[PDB]
């Protein structure tokens, strides 16, 4: 046995293209649309729950994941690749930051760590790149609210608003017209729902849409009282009901 | 490095004209506590060898499993496993002797003294000793622990040198062994009355005798003894 694939499976072609990264981006293009919008007092990330069968319970499949109490992530592309990245992202948030500094990492640095993991799958021996693009939304004390995209290559960029996957080109145009620097969080959620309706064919409700916010601190979700400086998580996943309430004012 | 915990005492043995005898009591001592009263410390290997073991019992039970595995392994791809390529006493001893010395040389000994008694292919008597240090020696009589100090003197009155072996019958040899076991019962504080005895003869093969007892004991003279002076 032994892993005898100690050489790169991603290499430069004569034209300067890294084929395996380009093909991973193609796999991302085929994936279901997800988006992110940044407001003045929050961030929203959203996607369609494209259920593979109606017998499946799509609540059990989580496309929008908590990474830290103040950071969340959504994807487009290959689901399994996303799941293992979420596991590695949560662990690296502790091992390379919380266990050292006694606090959760800021958004940009966690993103950077996830980006590093994806870059190494682009250069290390005997592996293919991750077939996903991530959108990571988060808050921290000194940088405030932020939104980042991460691609298969490991490259990451900050956004005011963006989309990835299937109908990203049309969605990004829709967001350019609507976005401004004076949006409140509710206005951003409203725009996210409008934008996401264009790329959804079938049913459009709280059971077929997954949507989460990075907003105010939620002391009700903390699980314990008695420490004034611990005020709870800023990440919150909206319920099926909460989505349907905003679809009547649509 | 360890310390022995549960221990077995003397193993005694001698050669006679046609074979070898070996014996050892059925006690497992836990310090001065005589904890386990039914321990077999003679372990036969095939029909031509008996390995007598004293010292730490857990290390004995490990050696017991090694011999059991040795029989299995010899049988593999061996059409003559019950004939010309069967295990000899000399093979079994040398294996153990190797192990014991390797184990001492890693500073983690098997805390035992062992006597391998048997008869070879050509009818020759085999009797050899090995201990936790890997020291080995052979003699017309051999004994471990207290047996070395008390049994050997008595057994050497029967077979004092090599030339006395053909002159010693199995009846004379067994008698001498049985008396020695009684003497050890009188005088070794970590012994028991019950014991096992094995005979390996070139004609009659392996005879294994369990549940023997020390008998014909002299205690009557105790009644006359009164005080300390």
């Amino acid at each position: 046995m032994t892993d005898r694939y100690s050489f790169s499976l991603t290499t430069f072609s004569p034209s300067g293209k890294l084929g395996q990264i380009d093909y991973a981006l193609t796999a991302v293009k085929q994936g279901v649309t997800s988006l992110g919008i940044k407001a003045t007092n929050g961030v929203v990330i959203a996607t369609e729950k494209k259920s593979s069968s109606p017998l499946a319970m799509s609540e059990t499949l989580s496309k929008v994941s908590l990474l830290t109490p103040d950071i969340g992530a959504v994807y487009s592309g290959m689901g399994p690749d996303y799941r293992v990245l979420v596991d590695k992202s949560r662990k690296v948030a502790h091992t390379s930051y919380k266990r050292i500094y006694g606090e959760y990492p800021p958004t940009k640095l966690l993103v950077s760590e996830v980006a590093k993991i994806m870059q190494e799958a682009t250069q290390s021996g005997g592996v293919r790149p991750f077939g996903v693009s991530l959108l990571i939304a988060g808050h921290d004390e000194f940088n405030g609210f932020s939104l980042y995209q991460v691609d298969p290559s490991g490259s990451y960029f900050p956004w005011k608003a963006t989309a990835i996957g299937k109908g990203s080109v049309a969605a990004k145009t829709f967001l350019e017209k609507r976005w401004n620097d004076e949006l409140e969080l509710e206005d951003a959620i409203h725009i996210a729902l409008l934008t996401l309706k264009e790329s959804v064919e079938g049913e459009f409700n709280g059971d077929t849409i997954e949507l989460a916010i990075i907003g105010d601190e939620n002391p009700d979700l903390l699980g314990y009282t008695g420490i004034p400086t611990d005020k709870g998580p800023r990440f919150r996943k909206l319920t099926s009901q909460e989505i349907n309430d905003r679809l009547e004012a649509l | 490095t360890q310390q022995p915990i549960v221990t077995g005492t003397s193993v005694i043995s001698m050669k006679y004209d046609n074979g070898v005898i070996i014996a050892a009591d059925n006690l497992g001592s836990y310090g001065s506590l005589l904890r386990f009263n039914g321990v077999e410390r003679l372990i036969p290997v095939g029909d031509n060898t008996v390995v007598g073991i004293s010292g730490d019992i857990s290390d004995m039970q490990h050696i017991e499993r090694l011999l059991k595995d040795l029989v299995t392994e010899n049988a593999y791809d061996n059409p003559l496993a019950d004939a010309e390529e069967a295990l000899e006493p000399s093979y079994i001893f040398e294996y153990l002797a190797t192990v014991m010395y390797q184990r001492r040389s890693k500073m983690n000994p098997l805390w035992n003294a062992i006597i391998v008694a048997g008869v070879q292919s050509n009818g020759d008597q085999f009797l050899r000793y090995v201990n936790l240090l890997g020291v080995t020696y052979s003699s017309p009589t051999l004994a471990t622990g207290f047996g070395a100090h008390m049994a050997n003197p008595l057994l050497r009155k029967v077979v004092d040198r090599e030339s006395d072996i053909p002159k010693t019958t199995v009846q004379v040899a067994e008698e001498a062994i049985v008396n020695a076991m009684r003497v050890l019962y009188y005088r070794d504080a970590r012994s028991s009355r019950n014991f096992s005895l094995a005979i390996i003869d070139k004609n009659t093969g392996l005879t294994f005798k369990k549940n023997l007892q020390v008998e014909n004991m002299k205690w009557d003279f105790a009644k006359d003894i009164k005080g300390y002076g």
């Binding site: - | 490095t1 040389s105 240090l133 020291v135 080995t136 052979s138 003699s139």
Partner: protein, 111 residues
């Protein structure tokens, strides 16, 4: 504590004549005040007209003699059945002994 060494007593004597050599040794093997054996050979023919004894701790003695005998065997395999000269044997034994410089073979050796 476990003591890996022991003393099996005995005494050995080597004398070199003009065209011969003798290596003698008693046959008694002991521990403390007990006799283990009255006849336990201690001087060994090792092939190539070389005799050897390693007196002291009999387990280390036996181990060393056994390894030298084996060294004679492999010398024949590796060098076209060449006879191992007494001086060459001596130097080989030095390396066997010094190989365990920090866990010595507890023996006085004569060939």
């Amino acid at each position: 504590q476990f003591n890996p060494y022991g003393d099996n007593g005995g005494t050995i004597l080597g004398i070199a004549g003009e065209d011969f050599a003798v290596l003698a040794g008693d046959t008694r093997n002991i521990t403390d005040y007990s006799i283990n054996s009255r006849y336990e050979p201690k001087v060994f023919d090792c092939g190539d007209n070389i005799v050897m004894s390693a007196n002291g701790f009999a387990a280390d003695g036996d181990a060393l003699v056994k390894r030298f005998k084996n060294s004679v065997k492999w010398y024949h395999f590796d060098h076209n059945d060449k006879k191992l000269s007494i001086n060459s044997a001596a130097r080989n034994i030095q390396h066997l002994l010094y190989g365990k410089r920090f866990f010595p073979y507890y023996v006085h050796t004569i060939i």
